[model samples]
Target chain A: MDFRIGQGYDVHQLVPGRPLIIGGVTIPYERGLLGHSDADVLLHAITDALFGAAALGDIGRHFDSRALLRECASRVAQAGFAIRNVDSTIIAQAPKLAPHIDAMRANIAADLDLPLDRVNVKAKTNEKLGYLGRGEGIEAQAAALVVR
Target chain B: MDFRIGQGYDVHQLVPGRPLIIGGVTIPYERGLLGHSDADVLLHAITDALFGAAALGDIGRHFSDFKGADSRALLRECASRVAQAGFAIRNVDSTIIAQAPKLAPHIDAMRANIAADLDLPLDRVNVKAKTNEKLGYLGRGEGIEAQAAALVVRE
Candidate 1:
């Protein structure tokens, strides 16, 4: 087969003292999702989907979620799938967003070693409903198609 | 090679007070898998695998996952890919398992979507399973899950 596909989904609780990063850009906000990396929900989901398409393991498997792995100075392990690029959408209902979107796109491109044109980040508001409209939490979903 | 490969997996939690629906039919049962629309996990997964073959995102993005878009609406969105029609789908194979509502009788119509509609041959579509085989939430009958693999190509 010359082509294939994979997809990923994830969630995290937003807490204080962290930078709100989505789609790889940091947002100046009250809180952010907790994780080993910058915790870009959209990017992580995109990464999982890309890996899933190729039957490769997920973020937690290849990239260490262990405490030492996050220290950066510790032994660095590198892993990558035969991915071309990806497109993703973010859903949120808070922080009067959009200003940080440009930076988020740049951050994602740099984070994945992808060119700016290959990464497209779309900012969206979920129209105030469910847990999102209630303002209790934020959620991000991503889908990617990759070829090996 | 004259082959392509893609796979899809989906899970839906069983919820009370809903009609039992799967693979496009309302099977006779008490509870249905709760989802934004019809929640046909089998069809949804198959559509996803097709999109993967074409390197075209997935069901949720095109499907919208909100009130405006309905069940399997995302598959129709994928139908737009036929705009590049010369690329033929080689085949599809999948499996669906449920502890209670037996899916064996429904297999033919289910295969038709891929073989007849997607233009694959019947031999190319294979759906198999081992029931609840009695384990996990699936065996406990808490919900339903379906997985599918598809192949498509263009020359």
Candidate 2:
């Protein structure tokens, strides 16, 4: 079993007047993520995890776009590894994501060219703690497993 | 080829009048993590990852005698449960996010504790530390966060 595992984390501030795109789905929300690119925080985290598992540095080393996630999957495949599965969690306080999780997972599976069951997405609120709880920003964490 | 992967994220506020225990090691610091247990953020993250990999519930659903409890013991118990659930832990990697008290010096000790608790070889368990680059609560030194990833295979 030649397996390697990696994890990634990303956070972006939420601001008004921007589109809320996560996992390639545009969520209907009051505030969108603030970033240089599309600011899809969940995809960014998953992309980083894929890169990390393939020992390919991070998303910063590549670039960001809606297509960046597909590019990351290609890079990992080119690195002689097949992604086994990925699990991720999205942390936010508002804009209820439960309804959007299936769409999010489908988008990720389509981008990665994997079965939907191999990709998992979970959403949770920050329980009113700090930055995430206060709805100032959104955060995502992901874990990926790859095998040769 | 039956493998599963899981990830965990945990954070605790940094406040006075608490012991700063992380990865079951006591760190001498001005402030400690505020939590119901020893507040070993690293161990808690790892435990969550293990449980998540096994498709079990989160930490709160399993244990309740956690008020000032020893996290090391909690982690060990969780590891045993994972094994009993017919999965063998393959490897685990984690990162600790903090802004103060340079953690690099104690990273090896933390790794050893995790490796021992999980009964894995030292090389199979990796622990990394990073600062949040002054980006948020973690950057301001108001809290410490830990993230972990674990891989497990069905026995």
Candidate 3:
């Protein structure tokens, strides 16, 4: 087989002190995501999905979650594969992620060395149903396709 | 050059009166998923992934109006679309996110059912589960969520 697919998911709690950084962009928000690192939930998800596609392990089996695109490029090269396309969704209940979608996609494409058209990022809210609805945290899911 | 990938995500609210069905298997639970259809979260995710890989519309685009445990039917139709588009099912990997009822015990069955629908071997399909870490609605045991990734190849 010349192609493979992988998926990733991540969630982080929002706290009063941290900056709401997602996909390498710091949004002007009151609360930021809580984690050991920058906690870019979207990047973390995309990183894990790439690892899964390459049959390498998830983020937990790796060194760290930050510098995701750099790490991803190295791993993709190690796996002897090139990225095809990526589609992902950011599920948050607040802070309006729509305005930042373009920048997020640009950063990802640039960092991954892929054309803008090959990287797709969409934002969605949790429809006010759960903790996300309560604006307690943010979650992200990503899917990646790679080829040798 | 011959492979394509697709992804799907789905969620269902848990209700006391409904039956908790996932992966087309009716699991015994105090609360079932609330939805117009049977609310098999896992199956729905896989179906959507299959359609996504084939560049077809999702579950809502094709079906969802009239249904009760017809997830296999949707999957079959998605596979047909893949075939018509000059591709065949290769494999699928999926995750079921929930906080209750312990899903690992049923992973094998779920994989088998999905493999059958995609007309692939058992080893080609995989199912995984995780909790929302007690942080969200899913972590609070209010609902179940599922995610899936599918790969297809030129026939």
Candidate 4:
């Protein structure tokens, strides 16, 4: 089997007045991620992982959450690679994300055209360390396995 | 053929009056990572990636007493547990984000340490270094961050 693995990490500042959109699911929160676009941090990380595994590039090289994700999936398919699975972790110190984890996973699966079981999303707090622990921003990390 | 993948990210503040240990190799630096243990950020990230790939709990779930801990030993234990779970590590790739102390000079030793601990060839374990474009907390050199990805296989 020809297997390649890649990882991605992304961070965005949290600001008030913006919708808290993560993994394409908007959560009810006082602050949302700030970025040039929608700032869907999770999808951006996942997209970067897929592109990295395919050796294409990164999200900044191509790039929204769902549209960008669909484009990434198509590009991977065009490269004759199939995504095996992806696992990700969201680092946040605020509102609980467990309630919306499944919804986020579903959005990813649909965008990638993969079974829900193949995508996993995990959440964690920064354990009160630094900028993240202080709730200045949120970060996401992802790992993906692809086969040709 | 079955393959599993995992990723880990870790960061620790930089402080004075501490030994700068990373990847089991002590580096000559003015500030070392401040943590309960030795704060070998690279090894900790790799250990977490191994555990994440194997679907096991995170670093905190298994070990707690990290006071002046040896990260090399922690990595070895993590590798052993992954093996015990019926998975063999295929390869691991990592990147260390820092602005100071140019890591390129010490990457070879880091690779050697990880390769030995995971029982993989040096070529199979790859380590890269990057600067965060002088942005955010990482750029200011307040702390050091490491990210790692691992591929494990069974059957």
Instruction: State the lDDT of candidate 4 residue by residue for B91-119, as single tens digits.
Output: 78776778788887887798899999989
Give the runs in model 4 whose Cα sits over 4 Å from its true position.
B1-136, B152-155
* Over 4 Å off, model 2: A10-142
Best by lDDT: 2
Which of the numbered candidates is closest to the native, going by highest TM-score? 3
Which residue pairs come into collision in candidate 1? Answer: A5-A53, A6-A53, A7-A49, A8-A49, A25-A104, A129-A133
TM-scores of the candidates are 0.52, 0.62, 0.67, 0.61
Output the number of the DockQ-best candidate.
3
DockQ of predicted model 3: 0.25
lDDT of 3 by residue, A38-144 (tens): 88999988887787666565565464344766787788778797898888999998899889999999889988889999999989998998788888889898888
Model 3 chain B, TM? 0.93
Computed on C-alpha atoms, the DockQ of candidate 1 is 0.03
lDDT over C-alpha atoms for residue A144 of model 2: 86
Task: Give fnat for candidate 1.
Answer: 0.02
Of the two candidates 2 and 4, the one with more favorable TM-score, higher being better, is 2
- The 10 consecutive residues of candidate 1 chain A with the worst lDDT sum are A68-77
Question: If both were scored by DockQ, which would come out higher, candidate 2 or candidate 3?
Answer: 3
Lowest lDDT sum, 10 consecutive residues, model 3 chain B, at B64-73
CAPRI tier of model 4: incorrect
Ranking by TM-score: 3, 2, 4, 1
**Tens digits of lDDT, candidate 3, B1-155:** 66677788899999898888888777889999877678888888988888888888798887855556466776787687778878887767777888899887777687778878888877567676666657966878999999888888766
